[PDB]
């Protein structure tokens, strides 16, 4: 029974730079349609059969662009929202590159045409010049700012005027304003020329002076959008309510259905990585991608999944091929217009959520157990900022682990580990505003009382002076039998990192002054003292010890007596050897626009960052600097402030250098206190 063709499905993302107006445009959509959300659209003139629009509203911030990446990958088409005043933003370029990576056929909506400085054609030219795109206006704005009244449809060559009294639910077709007729004819010719380029037949008609029909123009522009050759540009502004309705008609006319998109690539679970495809059909084996996990207070884990092939029912044991885990599907609903119609028939093209999946993560493939496939995996970027989180109480201690676990499950770009040296819980994320939201959820949804600090710098200990002839004599001949042990050691610094063990032991015992059986106990006594340095109780590194002189007693000498002597000798020698506190240094790489370059280093200089050099790149300059871990905290948001949000840094542990005398001494004193 032919019900609603999958060719009527529009799986679309609304994507924009932070602060551009995209969910208000979506709220306008829901109002006009009748209502991840499903909506139904029949056209602003009711000229279309009912189309199913599944909308994913993607975050504007770059701290949550990981969600945008997941969405773009799982979606068919996109609506790119631009501010008429601000135009193409640095963050728009990031989202634009992500949509290019996934080849998402997309259109453009120039919103905020009611604000001061609104300029449609300026934004069209910025899409061309900054994004390297081919923008083709479908519409022209009638007026600007407070004088924005409507739009010209360049396909129909008519003005669209929306009724302000019904919030734009009704519209009239008018003749083009007399001051715009010349400009409308110019852009109409540019639109027809852009349509004619879609095929040799349409190019011949156009060059022959034959007028293209509205159906040929629409079909030709659709083909090129699907090929990602052009971007169709629409305009309009809500509040007075304009554009959205005609942008929704452009979604029907020009954006892909699930059958217009290439088959999804995957790998067979045969151990040979055999390539396979899944076509957008109900008659194919079931395959779906889990793309979002949300924690719900009432139903537990919601796993959002997009079906690409086949059909599944609410309550169907499928196979999580990625995690090799048979997962019985839970309760599955669907946002049928306003209601949440529980669907027991998730067909190809549909987006739904399952309740109570246990071993499913974002990026997992859910498939038919009799036809295993792994759909292509999501690569998750490495976290760029880390902070220490400490529980206030012991109740908060266990609760913290639980809360952070849930947050790491729903958001892969969020990492949590315990630092083995500090025993602090370290949390890491895709920016500090990202970490701020994570902390807020932890101390609200889960209400876990925690302090936010900085990852403790891994302080080390070493000497800066050879000391010779250091006597250690454990002579405890008391309490029954005596315990005699006597060693003489030299202590000397090693070059930093010259020994992968951080420690050298030289046995230079001559004359059997110490029996060879006790020499391992002396070394073990030193190695235990290396774990807790005599200066501040940090591990001692980059040190050599030569045992060359010693003495035993035939009855009273013990293995651990010589280990006690070794510790005495070590503690006395270490204090004489001018002990110092060490530091880690981090190799930092910053990518920035050439005009923002200066600011980056100004701050890095205050952060004790020894700028090694620079590699002027295409974006601008790739500056390299040696910056202490202590000064590499809170840099994500600071960089975002200096560079207006167009810079990305990386950092790696470089080497164990010497902390500046001031820094080292200050910490030594604080630790002693």
């Amino acid at each position: 029974a032919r019900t609603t063709p999958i060719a009527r499905y529009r799986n679309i993302g609304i994507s924009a730079h932070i602060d551009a107006g995209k969910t208000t445009t979506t709220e306008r959509i829901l109002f006009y349609t009748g209502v991840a959300t499903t909506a139904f659209w029949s056209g602003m003139a009711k000229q279309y059969e009912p189309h199913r629009i599944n909308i994913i509203d993607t975050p504007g911030h770059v701290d949550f662009t990981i969600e945008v990446e997941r969405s773009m990958r799982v979606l068919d088409g996109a609506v790119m929202v631009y501010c008429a005043v601000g135009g193409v933003q640095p963050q728009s370029e990031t989202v634009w590159r992500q949509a290019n990576k996934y080849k998402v056929p997309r259109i453009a909506f120039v919103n905020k045409m009611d604000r001061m400085g609104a300029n449609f054609l300026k934004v069209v030219n910025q899409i061309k010049t900054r994004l390297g795109a081919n923008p083709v206006p479908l519409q022209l704005a009638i007026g600007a700012e407070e004088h924005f009244t409507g739009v010209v449809d360049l396909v129909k060559m008519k003005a669209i005027n929306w009724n302000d009294a019904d919030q734009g639910v009704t519209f009239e077709y008018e003749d083009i304003p007399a001051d715009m007729v010349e400009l409308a004819n110019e852009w109409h010719q540019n639109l027809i020329e852009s349509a004619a380029e879609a095929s040799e037949e349409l190019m011949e008609k156009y060059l022959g002076g034959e007028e293209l029909t509205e159906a040929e123009i629409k079909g030709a522009l659709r083909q090129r959008v699907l090929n990602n050759e052009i971007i169709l540009v629409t305009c309009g502004s809500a509040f007075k309510n304009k554009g959205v309705q005609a942008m929704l008609d452009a979604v029907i006319d020009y954006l892909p259905s699930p059958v217009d998109v290439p088959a999804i690539n995957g790998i067979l679970d045969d151990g040979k990585d055999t390539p396979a495809e899944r076509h957008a059909s109900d008659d194919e084996p079931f395959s779906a991608l889990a793309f979002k996990i949300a924690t719900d207070p009432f139903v537990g884990n919601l796993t959002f999944f997009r079906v690409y092939s086949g059909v599944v029912n609410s309550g169907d044991t499928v196979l999580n091929s990625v995690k090799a885990a048979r997962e019985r599907f839970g309760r599955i609903v669907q946002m049928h217009a306003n209601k949440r119609e529980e669907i027991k028939e998730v067909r190809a093209g549909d987006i739904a959520a399952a309740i109570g999946l246990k071993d499913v993560t974002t990026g997992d493939t859910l498939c038919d157990p009799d036809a295993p496939i792994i759909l292509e995996r999501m690569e998750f970027p490495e976290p760029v900022i880390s902070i220490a989180v400490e529980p206030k109480t012991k109740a908060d201690q266990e609760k913290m682990g639980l809360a952070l676990g849930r947050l790491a499950k729903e958001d892969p770009s969020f990492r949590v580990w315990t630092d083995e040296e500090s025993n602090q819980t370290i949390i890491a994320g895709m920016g500090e505003l990202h970490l701020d939201i994570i902390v807020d959820r932890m101390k609200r949804e889960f209400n876990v009382e925690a302090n936010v600090g900085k990852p403790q710098v891994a302080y080390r200990e070493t000497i800066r002076q050879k000391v010779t002839d250091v006597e250690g004599k454990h002579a405890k001949q008391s309490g029954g039998r005596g315990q005699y042990g006597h060693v003489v050691i030299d202590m000397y610094p090693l070059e930093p990192g010259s020994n992968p063990k951080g420690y050298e032991f030289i046995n230079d015992i001559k004359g059997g002054v110490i029996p060879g059986e006790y020499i391992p106990a002396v070394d073990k006594g030193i190695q235990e003292q290396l774990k807790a340095g005599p200066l501040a109780g940090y591990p001692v590194v980059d040190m050599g010890i030569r045992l060359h002189f010693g003495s035993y007693h035939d009855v009273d000498s013990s293995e651990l007596a010589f280990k006690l002597a070794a510790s005495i000798a070590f503690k006395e020698g270490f204090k004489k050897a001018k002990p110092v506190l060490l530091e880690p240094i981090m190799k930092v790489e910053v990518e920035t626009p050439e005009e923002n370059t200066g600011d980056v280093i100004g701050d890095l200089s205050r952060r004790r960052g020894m700028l090694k050099g620079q590699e002027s790149e295409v974006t601008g300059v790739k500056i390299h600097a040696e910056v202490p871990l202590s000064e590499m905290f809170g840099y994500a948001t600071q960089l975002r402030s200096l560079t207006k949000g167009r810079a990305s840094y990386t950092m790696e542990f470089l080497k164990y250098d010497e902390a500046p005398s001031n820094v080292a001494q200050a910490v030594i004193e604080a630790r002693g206190k």
Binding site: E594, T597, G598, G613, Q614, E615, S616, V621
Partner: protein, 141 residues
């Protein structure tokens, strides 16, 4: 050539490749390609001997094309070439680095009068006398 707004005289070498990292300086608050440079210098490299950094300029025209201003390995690095002792700068007056004859520069001043442009071959000799003592040299026949 063009205005001094697309002016950085640079290029210590050609085989070290990229003139953007430390090796090649500048490339800051200016904006231009980097591999689009040494290819015209690749038809130009094999006349210059290495160890002799030649000053050329990234002169960018108004239509995105840029080539260089061929000069000549100059005063400074030829006294690290024709004498045989490198930079060592700072000590003209402390200890003896090297004395250079009168005619040892005049034979390469004809090469250096295509590098230095005040007037003449003889007239540029007393500025080969310049940076030599800043490198630390002394000069007498």
């Amino acid at each position: 050539a063009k205005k001094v707004q697309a002016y950085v005289k640079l290029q210590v070498a050609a085989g070290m490749a990229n003139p953007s990292p430390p090796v090649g300086p500048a490339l800051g608050q200016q904006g231009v390609n980097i591999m689009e440079f040494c290819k015209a210098f690749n038809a130009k490299t094999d006349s210059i001997e290495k160890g002799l950094p030649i000053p050329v300029v990234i002169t960018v025209y108004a239509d995105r094309s840029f080539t260089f201003v061929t000069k000549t390995p100059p005063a400074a690095v030829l006294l690290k070439k024709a004498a045989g002792i490198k930079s060592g700068s700072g000590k003209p007056n402390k200890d003896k680095v090297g004395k250079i004859s009168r005619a040892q520069l005049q034979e390469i001043a004809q090469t250096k009068a295509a590098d230095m442009t005040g007037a003449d071959i003889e007239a540029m000799t007393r500025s080969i006398e310049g940076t030599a003592r800043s490198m630390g040299l002394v000069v007498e026949d």
